Design a protein around this ligand. Sequence first.
Ligand SMILES: N[C@@H](CC/C=C/[B-](O)(O)O)C(=O)O
Ligand SMILES: N[C@@H](CC/C=C/[B-](O)(O)O)C(=O)O
Ligand SMILES: N[C@@H](CC/C=C/[B-](O)(O)O)C(=O)O
Ligand SMILES: [Mn+2]
Ligand SMILES: [Mn+2]
Ligand SMILES: [Mn+2]
Ligand SMILES: [Mn+2]
Ligand SMILES: [Mn+2]
Ligand SMILES: [Mn+2]
Lengths: 314, 314, 314
Amino acid sequence: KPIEIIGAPFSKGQPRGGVEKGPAALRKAGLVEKLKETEYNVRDHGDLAFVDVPNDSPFQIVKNPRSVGKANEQLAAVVAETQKNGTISVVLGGDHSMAIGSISGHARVHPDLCVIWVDAHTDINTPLTTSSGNLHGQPVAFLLKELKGKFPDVPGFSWVTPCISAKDIVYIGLRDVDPGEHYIIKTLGIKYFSMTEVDKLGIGKVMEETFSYLLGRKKRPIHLSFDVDGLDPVFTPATGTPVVGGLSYREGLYITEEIYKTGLLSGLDIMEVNPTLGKTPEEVTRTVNTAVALTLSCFGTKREGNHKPETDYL
Amino acid sequence: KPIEIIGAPFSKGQPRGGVEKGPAALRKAGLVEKLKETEYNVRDHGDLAFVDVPNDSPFQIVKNPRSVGKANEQLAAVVAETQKNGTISVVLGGDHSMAIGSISGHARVHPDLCVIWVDAHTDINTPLTTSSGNLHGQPVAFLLKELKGKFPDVPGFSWVTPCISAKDIVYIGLRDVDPGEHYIIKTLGIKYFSMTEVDKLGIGKVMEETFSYLLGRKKRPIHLSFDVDGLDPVFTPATGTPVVGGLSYREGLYITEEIYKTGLLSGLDIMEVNPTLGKTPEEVTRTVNTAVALTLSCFGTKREGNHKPETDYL
Amino acid sequence: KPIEIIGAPFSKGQPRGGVEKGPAALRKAGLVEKLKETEYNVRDHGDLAFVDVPNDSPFQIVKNPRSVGKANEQLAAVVAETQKNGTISVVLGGDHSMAIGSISGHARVHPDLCVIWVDAHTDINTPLTTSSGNLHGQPVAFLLKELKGKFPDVPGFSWVTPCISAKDIVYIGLRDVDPGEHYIIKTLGIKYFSMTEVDKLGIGKVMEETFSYLLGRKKRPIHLSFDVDGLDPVFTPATGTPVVGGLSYREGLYITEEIYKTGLLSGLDIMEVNPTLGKTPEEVTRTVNTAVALTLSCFGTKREGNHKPETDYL
Ligand SMILES: N[C@@H](CC/C=C/[B-](O)(O)O)C(=O)O
Ligand SMILES: N[C@@H](CC/C=C/[B-](O)(O)O)C(=O)O
Ligand SMILES: N[C@@H](CC/C=C/[B-](O)(O)O)C(=O)O
Ligand SMILES: [Mn+2]
Ligand SMILES: [Mn+2]
Ligand SMILES: [Mn+2]
Ligand SMILES: [Mn+2]
Ligand SMILES: [Mn+2]
Ligand SMILES: [Mn+2]
């Protein structure tokens, strides 16, 4: 199977500068080389160059709408391309707002795909409900069909086409949801596993249920959008929005290991890694490393170990 | 539902000065204001003023018996009063010896109540078994009917009437129990979930079991006495008796969330928060915040989120 | 029951100097005195003096083969001796290569014993598969009957007799296995619980299954070889090969508590504690203390508490 790394050094989805250095950090840690050591063919597409939209006036409360909408239109193009020729796309974030382009592009080639969203936040604020005009917290709002026309069109997002419905997404790791967002998920019947369900069920049963919910009827492509803040700040401290009480390093890998086993992984997002937010070099190293680990886990690396077929080690 | 905060800045239950600053810290952190944001009506009763018993000679090995017995008689009066008015009492500790008056007052109004004791210590030492004469580790001893007459009457506690039996209490979080105390709980058949049972069962099944054990037959009022040292020192380091290998921030919240769901919470105790024992300001802030979070969780705050009824956010 | 502590200050099993200071550190922390406080009779045999093999040329890639083989021949003699007298042997590591002599000695007296191996590593590399010639990662290879003749005889190990088969061993805590080793355990059908099974099942079910697998048919003596690196680096940082995503302090004690309850503990190994690898004195103290705790847990110490029989504390 082919793998194609796509860097998206973008950061207008939110106020904190740094996330755009995410892809560099993950590469510097040997992500690409370590991936080659797996049974997958790897091709690094490089980092996309995003053209800055001059005079990008805020839309009501939404900030940098055009720059974000354009950077995402570009990314969607690229992702659709690699997806078209049957390769698995792996996007390296900047901020999670790039998930708009990532998933959009993916859905063009695979319209029946489902989304597993490992986050601490639902990122489903609509331009009307956001308290801050930060777009990294509104990705899903622009993707859901059920949210079509429930908020004014935003400058630069006209190209977007709601590709997935409320029945095709499942949240895992939730613990910091705004009143508005909570209203939305309850109202639309979205499936989720907040930290309370994780604590209650254990990470084993949670994964078991997310699959029977999304793959029960039809087996379809899987798009994993992983926000590094879904793990507890103790594991991934170098991010913009820390939230105590999150998934452990162990649980994170267990999610990625189970997803690898389904053989349906089609698209991946490793978002919000911000190298400039580490209080100590070690905090940044901790974060990058676990991000990398999760990525390799998605593509086979098992904790029980791995050995190359047909090779008699004795 | 009405909520009434009652401050109990008391500390003769133990040697370390500081716990009496507990209530101030919790208020300074915005506990009261944050509670008003919930669906509950909140009334701050203020801090009780405890009259110091001059010439409080120790009783055999028990220290400050009269000052502790008096402060607890006063608190019980106050708690019975608010309970009578049908409000939920929330006591802010000082040290855990105030649970004597808190639960006593509560039981006067609701004699059929049950006690969930989240601690690391059983606090069931009798005046005869204590190694130190500290009363904060003997609360339960003065409350259990089964321990009546098993120890000499103490100066200042004559007013106390054993209100609950061994079948009405369940311990969660245990990991530091004295030989005497362990003898007592084994002998009296007290239900408990030490860290081993939590590890073995998972916090979800532990809660499930504690409810069917205490509410299986009759649904009754619940009294949650929460000793902040029940969580691991990494979450609540500002306390007098830290003990490694404790409940996690996540588990703690899961206990409070499940208790909120029962709709039976009638009395709450947030004890042993000692602002002066933090090695760094951050340790104190860590402790106060998680204490505050547990309190709001007991009253509705969910990690999946909250939204106000009848409000169409779209 | 009698308990006999045997120090094995050895370190050619691996490159990092320091592990030989392991026994001293554990004693300095009061291990022996704390053990005497249990219901067990304790006898300290002292530290074995290992004679250095001059001109110990490496065997192909294997380092210090003769010094390691001799030190292990000596240890086995001593362990067989105490085992013969019906006492429980507790070996204090140096490096884990000493498990060769520890288990061998034990098996001489109890040929039907089983081995529970708490590690992050399988330590089952054969002289041919090792990437590094370090022996501390090949102990099990010299003990398995199924691996007899699958690798050239090594200088100084001729005295070794493969004592246990693939059906008598169970691994718990695995998360860093080499391709070769993974091939071996898969090919030989060895039972194991890597971190993914621990995450999926919970430490409670894991223990339940390890017993029904090794004690289902016949109840036999148990040999617990505990590599302190099996726990997460956050609990035992002072070791040569830390690996993130490991057993928690709680889980570790849960394993030792359940093993105590079986009443079948016959042999124990507390290995890889390296006092010189602690970044801060606290890291070393953290490590030694938890190592000591696990040891006392193996011999009765429970988190729910302990009290001496026949003593009426009231
Ligand atoms: N809820 C906040 C934060 C949302 C978080 C977005 B993130 O997960 O991408 O970091 C907002 O609505 O702006
Ligand atoms: N076991 C000690 C300590 C008891 C702990 C009481 B505390 O939980 O309120 O802090 C004693 O008996 O004095
Ligand atoms: N897999 C490495 C490391 C093995 C680890 C051994 B230890 O657990 O005793 O530390 C090697 O084969 O040398
Ligand atoms: Mn997030
Ligand atoms: Mn996000
Ligand atoms: Mn207490
Ligand atoms: Mn306590
Ligand atoms: Mn080892
Ligand atoms: Mn190891």
